[PDB]
Design an enzyme around this catalytic site. Structure first.
Site, mmCIF file in Angstrom:
data_model
loop_
_atom_site.group_PDB
_atom_site.id
_atom_site.type_symbol
_atom_site.label_atom_id
_atom_site.label_comp_id
_atom_site.label_asym_id
_atom_site.label_seq_id
_atom_site.Cartn_x
_atom_site.Cartn_y
_atom_site.Cartn_z
ATOM 1 N N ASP A 120 -68.117 -27.332 47.241
ATOM 2 C CA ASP A 120 -69.444 -26.954 46.767
ATOM 3 C C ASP A 120 -69.945 -27.976 45.740
ATOM 4 N N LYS B 198 -76.201 -39.409 36.618
ATOM 5 C CA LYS B 198 -76.542 -39.430 38.050
ATOM 6 C C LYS B 198 -75.686 -40.475 38.785
ATOM 7 N N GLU C 102 -77.235 -42.722 50.726
ATOM 8 C CA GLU C 102 -77.804 -43.828 49.936
ATOM 9 C C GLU C 102 -76.953 -45.094 50.009
ATOM 10 N N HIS D 117 -78.194 -53.936 45.459
ATOM 11 C CA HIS D 117 -78.582 -52.667 46.072
ATOM 12 C C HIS D 117 -79.630 -52.831 47.175
HETATM 13 C C1 LIG Z 1 -71.022 -54.401 45.667
HETATM 14 C C2 LIG Z 1 -72.423 -54.963 45.431
HETATM 15 C C3 LIG Z 1 -73.461 -54.040 46.070
HETATM 16 C C4 LIG Z 1 -72.495 -56.319 46.126
HETATM 17 O O1 LIG Z 1 -71.433 -57.119 45.630
HETATM 18 P P1 LIG Z 1 -71.555 -58.705 45.443
HETATM 19 O O2 LIG Z 1 -72.366 -59.289 46.574
HETATM 20 O O3 LIG Z 1 -72.018 -58.917 44.018
HETATM 21 O O4 LIG Z 1 -70.002 -59.117 45.486
HETATM 22 P P2 LIG Z 1 -69.034 -59.487 46.734
HETATM 23 O O5 LIG Z 1 -68.097 -60.512 46.148
HETATM 24 O O6 LIG Z 1 -69.835 -59.762 47.977
HETATM 25 O O7 LIG Z 1 -68.160 -58.172 46.960
HETATM 26 C C5 LIG Z 1 -67.256 -57.672 45.986
HETATM 27 C C6 LIG Z 1 -66.573 -56.435 46.537
HETATM 28 O O8 LIG Z 1 -67.509 -55.366 46.664
HETATM 29 C C7 LIG Z 1 -67.280 -54.657 47.891
HETATM 30 N N1 LIG Z 1 -68.438 -54.843 48.792
HETATM 31 C C8 LIG Z 1 -69.473 -55.677 48.634
HETATM 32 N N2 LIG Z 1 -70.331 -55.522 49.666
HETATM 33 C C9 LIG Z 1 -69.813 -54.577 50.479
HETATM 34 C C10 LIG Z 1 -70.230 -53.997 51.671
HETATM 35 N N3 LIG Z 1 -71.384 -54.376 52.263
HETATM 36 N N4 LIG Z 1 -69.456 -53.045 52.237
HETATM 37 C C11 LIG Z 1 -68.308 -52.655 51.663
HETATM 38 N N5 LIG Z 1 -67.882 -53.204 50.516
HETATM 39 C C12 LIG Z 1 -68.629 -54.152 49.913
HETATM 40 C C13 LIG Z 1 -66.012 -55.223 48.488
HETATM 41 O O9 LIG Z 1 -64.879 -54.482 48.038
HETATM 42 C C14 LIG Z 1 -66.008 -56.629 47.941
HETATM 43 O O10 LIG Z 1 -64.710 -57.193 47.927
HETATM 44 P P3 LIG Z 1 -64.274 -58.360 48.958
HETATM 45 O O11 LIG Z 1 -65.164 -58.287 50.170
HETATM 46 O O12 LIG Z 1 -64.477 -59.634 48.168
HETATM 47 O O13 LIG Z 1 -62.832 -57.984 49.213
HETATM 48 C C15 LIG Z 1 -72.659 -55.142 43.922
HETATM 49 O O14 LIG Z 1 -73.941 -55.746 43.729
HETATM 50 C C16 LIG Z 1 -72.593 -53.836 43.174
HETATM 51 O O15 LIG Z 1 -71.520 -53.314 42.928
HETATM 52 N N6 LIG Z 1 -73.748 -53.285 42.815
HETATM 53 C C17 LIG Z 1 -73.936 -52.030 42.103
HETATM 54 C C18 LIG Z 1 -74.561 -51.079 43.120
HETATM 55 C C19 LIG Z 1 -74.587 -49.667 42.578
HETATM 56 O O16 LIG Z 1 -74.200 -49.414 41.440
HETATM 57 N N7 LIG Z 1 -75.050 -48.736 43.401
HETATM 58 C C20 LIG Z 1 -75.185 -47.309 43.112
HETATM 59 C C21 LIG Z 1 -76.548 -46.869 43.643
HETATM 60 S S1 LIG Z 1 -77.923 -47.548 42.758
HETATM 61 C C22 LIG Z 1 -78.513 -46.330 41.598
HETATM 62 S S2 LIG Z 1 -78.956 -44.814 42.445
HETATM 63 C C23 LIG Z 1 -77.468 -45.996 40.518
HETATM 64 C C24 LIG Z 1 -77.956 -46.251 39.083
HETATM 65 C C25 LIG Z 1 -78.033 -47.756 38.834
HETATM 66 O O17 LIG Z 1 -79.271 -45.690 38.930
HETATM 67 C C26 LIG Z 1 -77.020 -45.548 38.095
HETATM 68 C C27 LIG Z 1 -77.368 -45.850 36.646
HETATM 69 O O18 LIG Z 1 -78.568 -45.989 36.310
HETATM 70 O O19 LIG Z 1 -76.439 -45.983 35.829
HETATM 71 N N1 LIG Z 2 -80.788 -42.984 39.943
HETATM 72 C C1 LIG Z 2 -81.621 -42.915 40.997
HETATM 73 O O1 LIG Z 2 -82.283 -41.917 41.249
HETATM 74 C C2 LIG Z 2 -81.772 -44.093 41.914
HETATM 75 C C3 LIG Z 2 -81.601 -45.392 41.441
HETATM 76 C C4 LIG Z 2 -81.760 -46.460 42.318
HETATM 77 C C5 LIG Z 2 -82.087 -46.203 43.639
HETATM 78 N N2 LIG Z 2 -82.252 -44.949 44.084
HETATM 79 C C6 LIG Z 2 -82.616 -44.817 45.497
HETATM 80 O O2 LIG Z 2 -83.978 -45.233 45.654
HETATM 81 C C7 LIG Z 2 -84.431 -44.796 46.946
HETATM 82 C C8 LIG Z 2 -85.874 -44.322 46.879
HETATM 83 O O3 LIG Z 2 -86.677 -45.413 46.462
HETATM 84 P P1 LIG Z 2 -88.245 -45.455 46.790
HETATM 85 O O4 LIG Z 2 -88.715 -44.027 46.774
HETATM 86 O O5 LIG Z 2 -88.939 -46.473 45.912
HETATM 87 O O6 LIG Z 2 -88.275 -45.884 48.368
HETATM 88 P P2 LIG Z 2 -88.172 -47.344 49.095
HETATM 89 O O7 LIG Z 2 -87.788 -48.427 48.131
HETATM 90 O O8 LIG Z 2 -87.325 -47.147 50.322
HETATM 91 O O9 LIG Z 2 -89.701 -47.571 49.537
HETATM 92 C C9 LIG Z 2 -90.757 -47.546 48.578
HETATM 93 C C10 LIG Z 2 -91.889 -48.408 49.108
HETATM 94 O O10 LIG Z 2 -92.561 -47.733 50.169
HETATM 95 C C11 LIG Z 2 -93.870 -48.300 50.288
HETATM 96 N N3 LIG Z 2 -94.776 -47.232 50.763
HETATM 97 C C12 LIG Z 2 -95.332 -47.171 51.992
HETATM 98 N N4 LIG Z 2 -96.099 -46.053 52.121
HETATM 99 C C13 LIG Z 2 -96.021 -45.380 50.957
HETATM 100 C C14 LIG Z 2 -96.585 -44.124 50.419
HETATM 101 N N5 LIG Z 2 -97.401 -43.356 51.176
HETATM 102 N N6 LIG Z 2 -96.248 -43.781 49.151
HETATM 103 C C15 LIG Z 2 -95.439 -44.548 48.394
HETATM 104 N N7 LIG Z 2 -94.895 -45.703 48.815
HETATM 105 C C16 LIG Z 2 -95.145 -46.158 50.068
HETATM 106 C C17 LIG Z 2 -94.233 -48.867 48.918
HETATM 107 O O11 LIG Z 2 -94.627 -50.240 49.030
HETATM 108 C C18 LIG Z 2 -92.971 -48.725 48.085
HETATM 109 O O12 LIG Z 2 -92.651 -49.919 47.363
HETATM 110 C C19 LIG Z 2 -83.468 -43.707 47.370
HETATM 111 O O13 LIG Z 2 -82.616 -44.204 48.404
HETATM 112 C C20 LIG Z 2 -82.658 -43.430 46.116
HETATM 113 O O14 LIG Z 2 -81.379 -42.905 46.429
HETATM 114 C C21 LIG Z 2 -82.111 -43.893 43.255
HETATM 115 C C1 LIG Z 3 -74.426 -16.004 42.565
HETATM 116 C C2 LIG Z 3 -74.367 -17.460 42.089
HETATM 117 O O1 LIG Z 3 -73.153 -17.684 41.350
HETATM 118 C C3 LIG Z 3 -74.387 -18.396 43.279
HETATM 119 C C4 LIG Z 3 -73.086 -18.349 44.067
HETATM 120 S S1 LIG Z 3 -72.847 -20.002 44.718
HETATM 121 C C5 LIG Z 3 -75.564 -17.822 41.213
HETATM 122 C C6 LIG Z 3 -75.669 -16.911 40.015
HETATM 123 O O2 LIG Z 3 -74.639 -16.405 39.521
HETATM 124 O O3 LIG Z 3 -76.802 -16.685 39.564
#
Ligand SMILES: CC(C)(COP(=O)(O)OP(=O)(O)OC[C@H]1O[C@@H](n2cnc3c(N)ncnc32)[C@H](O)[C@@H]1OP(=O)(O)O)[C@@H](O)C(=O)NCCC(=O)NCCS[C@@H](S)C[C@@](C)(O)CC(=O)O
Ligand SMILES: NC(=O)c1ccc[n+]([C@@H]2O[C@H](COP(=O)([O-])OP(=O)(O)OC[C@H]3O[C@@H](n4cnc5c(N)ncnc54)[C@H](O)[C@@H]3O)[C@@H](O)[C@H]2O)c1
Ligand SMILES: C[C@@](O)(CCS)CC(=O)O
Lengths: 410, 376
Positions: free
Chosen positions: A281, A265, A81, A379
């Protein structure tokens, strides 16, 4: 070692690898394990699990800026991701200015469960076991002399009763075992098997399950971080406002399980990839994490976020963290071994401490974005390639509108 | 398709791959993906995540014997731990004799939360917001006409209030969104950010979080399995006794969180490797799974195990299962696409149903082993 990794984000994979190699003094042969595909030979893969037909790759990355108890650490991460690695690196960058992450951990204690049924007096049977606990502990330790010499071993027992279940009375003994540098599963399961006949003799009951618990609440790792308002200021928001927003986000997670699940998460987005990178694991770590989050009878947040007496944002993460440097696939996978070399860890609890630092950083990164410009700007910019493919381009959408609709129009 | 794969456990990886290619009629290019290391090119890997320096392999396997609503399916799995694939395969084999796995699922519905603070009258604001839901729903659907064209989109809004928090009262709106064949996270996050200003205007508060919920309890997938005592007999125990032992192990998980965590971990041993194999987000599946397990305020078993009126062991698994066939990395990774090809799934919910069948089988296998192991 200096973990700041200048311009890492913009270097090629080859150039990144060379830099990492130079920092650590990796050999050419070590570097060759990442510079070429196929580091896990098919004969190893075929011996690891059943019905194998090949291997499956995920990207192997390194997060920058991490500092643990004053020492810079490079953190390998394997995941599919976008934005995870960037966010972790960013929050680690901020943490550096205020001392980095401060960590500690408990002894690596694991539970081995022994379930006993077929007795009408489980409450009495419990006292019979406790009366003879030394004898049980000695029998457990006889089974693993090496572990005891390494400074581990069965330390204690506890016994729990469930006198009224729909399947009748049950008694559950826990061996409490220090497993040193192992995750602990095979180590403690062997002890549970060893003590079973003795427990049957003591209680007059029938032993059923002999098995570890993945709710590893005596194997805790802890991380702390501090962030100042000046660090969180944006063009749109004062640093003080961002801190208040993050506290609002935290309280939301603490009251609503629909939020807590997502909040947690976000922590595991950082932790699980380090677990995968080290051959450990990830199902075990996930189960321990989420089960611990509901230990109060309410599913809440693993992290804590507060404001201290100087107005600074302070965060904690204390959680179960059962990991190994030995056991399972940690020694089997050549890249698991390389990851441990990159990390520089000498004990399993040291790896556990890095893991919670990463999870804490990860959570902070999510919350900071969510409390400011929202999650999508940063993101989706890093997801833009994937959106172009889904639509049937990536640079154009980076004009702050990364949506499939826009990709279709272009 | 015949998924029995006789002798599979003893064949070479190359021969296994050939037997799979024959059964499915895989192309030369598809077979070549798994035959040579490096199926994920560095150009692709480098675009997927940040700071990439290489790739990391896990074994890629296929579980045998699975049957879903009468149709045989081959199940790819990616994991490091032994016994999982064998246990799934063996339990699937036993399941075949009694009709295989029967599955169903809800529509692919995901929640998007919008958190609003600082409202003086949150309970009143909730009704004001609900009264204007159609406007909010329309606005959300403007952001994704492609999704709507395929029969997805925002369907409804629910609103919840939290009167007692240390940071004051909070109003939390949930967009309910049909995400078709996507996992849906990015999709609903865009909608949440899009409708926030309008909600703010209606309620007068300050919007904070705009984000999906991983407690995806409107996206449930269900599996059933049945096993007869004759199938479970061992050298030491009657099949009837083994069934009683499995029910005892289940009751243990239902009452003791220390056991339930391990029990559920075994379920995820089955599920997570399918999630990895199909390029899906396993952290999301894990969070939905374990949060759902404790929705009662007691962390319990995701599966159920009972004896029916004929004495047969019957198991269920109902749980959140957000997965995609499109979006995230599911299209980007060549082996994720190959995995989906092998599975033959036409919708995301079909993939979800296979996932819970595999989780159910893994739990059964784990319990069976533990319930039949002699005392030493
Ligand atoms: C970092 C960012 C993406 C961009 O940052 P900005 O453009 O705002 O800022 P900038 O000044 O450009 O960079 C500052 C520093 O960031 C580094 N860095 C940036 N880009 C990099 C890259 N391409 N490659 C490597 N490193 C990179 C680098 O150290 C840089 O320092 P330097 O270069 O200045 O030395 C920023 O927006 C962010 O953190 N977002 C949260 C995303 C998140 O939580 N995702 C989880 C999944 S989402 C979902 S799955 C998670 C969740 C939300 O659902 C969880 C929940 O709900 O609580
Ligand atoms: N906490 C979390 O779970 C969390 C938070 C933020 C992001 N994510 C990340 O979000 C990503 C998944 O996002 P997503 O599922 O919206 O995918 P995506 O954003 O990559 O694409 C979704 C888009 O696909 C298009 N699309 C085309 N054909 C489609 C079809 N048959 N059905 C549905 N949509 C279709 C739609 O326009 C839709 O907006 C994963 O990478 C996941 O890791 C997860
Ligand atoms: C055997 C078990 O621990 C998985 C091993 S990774 C699951 C269980 O106890 O029901």
């Amino acid at each position: 070692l200096d973990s700041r990794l200048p311009a890492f984000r913009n270097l090629s994979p080859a150039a990144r690898l060379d830099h990492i190699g130079q920092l650590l003094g990796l050999s050419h042969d070590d570097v060759s394990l990442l510079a070429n595909a196929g580091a896990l030979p098919m004969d190893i893969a075929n011996g690891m699990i059943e019905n194998v037909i090949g291997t499956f790759e995920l990207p192997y990355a390194v997060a920058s800026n991490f500092q643990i108890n004053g020492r810079d650490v490079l953190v390998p991460l394997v995941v599919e991701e976008p934005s995870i690695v960037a966010a972790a690196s960013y929050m680690a960058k901020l943490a550096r200015a205020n001392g980095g992450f401060t960590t500690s951990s408990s002894a690596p204690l694991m539970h081995a469960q022994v379930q006993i049924v077929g007795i009408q007096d489980p409450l009495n049977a419990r006292l019979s076991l406790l009366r003879r606990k030394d004898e049980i502990i000695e029998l457990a330790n006889r089974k693993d002399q090496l572990l005891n010499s390494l400074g581990g071993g069965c330390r204690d027992i506890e016994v729990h009763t469930f006198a009224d279940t729909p399947r009748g009375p049950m008694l559950v003994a826990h061996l409490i075992v220090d497993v040193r540098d192992a995750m602990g599963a095979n180590t403690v399961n062997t002890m549970a098997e060893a003590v079973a006949p003795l427990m049957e003799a003591i209680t007059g009951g029938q032993v059923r399950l002999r098995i570890l618990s993945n709710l590893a609440d005596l194997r805790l790792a802890r991380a702390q971080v501090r962030i100042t308002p000046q660090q969180l200021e944006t063009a749109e928001f004062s640093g003080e406002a961002v801190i208040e927003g993050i506290l609002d986000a935290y309280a939301f997670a603490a009251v609503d399980p629909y939020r807590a699940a997502t909040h947690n998460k976000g922590i595991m987005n950082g932790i699980d990839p380090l677990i995968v990178a080290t051959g450990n694991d990830w199902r075990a770590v996930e189960a321990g994490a989420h089960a611990y989050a509901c230990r109060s009878g309410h599913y809440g947040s693993l992290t804590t976020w507060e404001k201290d007496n100087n107005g600074h944002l302070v965060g904690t993460l204390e959680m179960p963290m059962p990991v190994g440097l030995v056991g399972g696939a940690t020694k089997t996978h050549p890249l698991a071994q390389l990851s441990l070399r990159i990390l520089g860890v000498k004990t399993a609890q040291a790896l556990a401490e890095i893991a919670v630092a990463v999870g804490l950083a990860q959570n902070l990164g999510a919350m900071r974005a969510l409390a400011t410009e929202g999650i999508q700007r940063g993101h989706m910019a890093l997801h833009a390639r994937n959106i172009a493919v889904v639509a049937g381009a990536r640079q154009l959408v980076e004009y702050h509108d990364v949506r499939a609709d826009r990709a279709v129009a272009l």
